[PDB]
Amino acid sequence: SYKLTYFPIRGLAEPIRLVLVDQGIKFTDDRINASDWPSMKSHFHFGQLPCLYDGDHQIVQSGAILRHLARKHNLNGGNELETTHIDMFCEGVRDLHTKYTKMIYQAYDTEKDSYIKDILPVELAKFEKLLATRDDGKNFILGEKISYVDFVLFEELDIHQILDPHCLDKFPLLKAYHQRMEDRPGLKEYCKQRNRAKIPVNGNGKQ
């Protein structure tokens, strides 16, 4: 059985949750309190969350969790080159996310607008171009078939759209793509409920 342990925010665990929910995989979504964290901190290999318990097995590190799940549930591509392609795209999503979190925790007042104007369009052009190399950008990252990295890019697009409602206005492939991921039947309800419960994107309440 699965138990995902993280803080009660989207942050680094959300794409993991998205994968499981969409694919109908039962898991315990274990959102801890700020207050209980200090006493569990030492239970985890690097003293951080997220953690996925697969049976007795402790799996920390969000990337290792995603790639493990990809392999257990056939969301890792159809061959060596596709697996490599999705990992490369996944890593570029995470690189954008590191720039995003930096501005959010460290410089929201002073760097939000330069982020939106000078950094984000440059970084979205890279995803737009890469997405267009499969099925002309009209289906998933690999074209015909969905893979773990589709849930990772969706979350990243979605939180950037919260930050800037017009971020995808000039990237038609990414825009239509976000919209196809959002209306997946396995997700439509979860994202509605998440939306109305006002689940924070980040630990400091800014987004």
Added chain:
Amino acid sequence: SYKLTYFPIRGLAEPIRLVLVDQGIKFTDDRINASDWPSMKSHFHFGQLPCLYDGDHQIVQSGAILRHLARKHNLNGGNELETTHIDMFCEGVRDLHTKYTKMIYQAYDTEKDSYIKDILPVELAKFEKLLATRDDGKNFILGEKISYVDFVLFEELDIHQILDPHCLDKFPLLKAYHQRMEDRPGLKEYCKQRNRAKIPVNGNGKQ
């Protein structure tokens, strides 16, 4: 054929160089000097390096490159769980590298000492303990069988020794582990010659 493009520093490409040298895999080590970089930036999927061409296939992202090499050259463990363990460990190593490089680039004068004292020992103790879970940490991360992550951890330990020569003194498993990686027939003439030429660890010359 393989061709590895990166700046003429260790930095993010070094673990990939070590994997290939050690294993006897022929590659072109394309060290591009900084002056020529704006001439080629737009040629790569994310406008960054390192890049590995495997035949005609462009592979950016150091992590995607590593795991690609792992699957292709039987350096990714013997089963699912093992693959997940080394991925977990590798991601631990990159997290310390992110702490390391922020200090190097942004705060070498002011934070080098406190990092050596307060941060670095806590982070290494995490590696010491995880290494112990397999074969009492007496061999490689997975036991008797070497894998891609050994090369990543080796590099991260080695550079940290250049920064503080005493950083492994209180970590018996990691100390011995570093020496065991350094003495591999495959990497030692390489490490001798690398040490001869005083190849910079980082792009800003600090180490």
